[PDB]
């Protein structure tokens, strides 16, 4: 139950300390469709291993049963990958930083079909974060909210999750009041941040479709772990 006890400051520090590392792409020649797909699914598979260990370090997530932890990760894994990709692409306008050695623009999204649509949506989210000057402390709160929220309405265990979500909400407001924002600015910014999660959810659903379709048309094998996270959305 320990997630509840923490101060707003302790929540932020606990989330920043849990942050997964930025991984590198296997790269290095110009990209074909099958090579582009291979680099992305290889990168996503290695990030999944780190996300699972980041989730266990999200306060209150270990307090859940194993079955619920699986469900929440199965529902939110692509959202979590996407908001992280969007976050680290903030200081690269017009480009998506999948990896420090893998910075792509939307014109390189043409290599795979239907990829450009998700690209522009992802670039739009990063442009929204940049316009709001999203802080790293705010980002880690949003990412854990995704983890706890996305799958909560597809389950006594909810109450805990909802109590942790309220604690993260208090943490968000605490960061904004610390930043000098007035009470009105605080709830307005809180609303602007959480509405972005609706769009991240939308991008994830379109990404699942796109991932499942080019799976059935079998250009690159997917890892069994990625294949299992994907089969959960069926």
């Amino acid at each position: 139950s320990l997630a509840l006890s923490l101060t707003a400051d302790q929540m932020v520090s606990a989330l920043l300390d849990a942050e997964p590392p930025i991984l590198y792409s296997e790269y290095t020649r110009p990209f074909s469709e099958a090579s582009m797909m291979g680099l992305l699914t290889n990168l996503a598979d290695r990030e999944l291993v780190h996300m699972i260990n980041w989730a266990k370090r999200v306060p209150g997530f270990v307090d859940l049963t194993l079955h619920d932890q699986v469900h929440l990760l199965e529902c939110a894994w692509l959202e979590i990958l996407m908001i992280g990709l969007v976050w680290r692409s903030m200081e690269h306008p017009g480009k998506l930083l999948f990896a420090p050695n893998l910075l792509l623009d939307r014109n390189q999204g043409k290599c795979v079909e239907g990829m450009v649509e998700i690209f522009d949506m992802l670039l739009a989210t990063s442009s929204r974060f940049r316009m709001m000057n999203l802080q790293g402390e705010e980002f880690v709160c949003l990412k854990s909210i995704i983890l706890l929220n996305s799958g909560v309405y597809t389950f006594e265990e909810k109450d805990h999750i909802h109590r942790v979500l309220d604690k993260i909400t208090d943490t968000l407001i605490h960061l904004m009041a610390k930043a000098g924002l007035t009470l009105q600015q605080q709830h307005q910014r809180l609303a602007q941040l959480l509405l972005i999660l609706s769009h991240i959810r939308h991008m994830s659903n379109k990404g699942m479709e796109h991932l499942y379709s080019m799976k059935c048309k079998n250009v690159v094998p997917l890892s069994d772990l990625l294949l299992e996270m994907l089969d959960a959305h069926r």
């Binding site: 194993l66 932890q69 699986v70 772990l225």
Partner: peptide, 10 residues
Amino acid sequence: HKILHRLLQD
């Protein structure tokens, strides 16, 4: 059995 199960206990 799921790989996700295993990684969560390790």
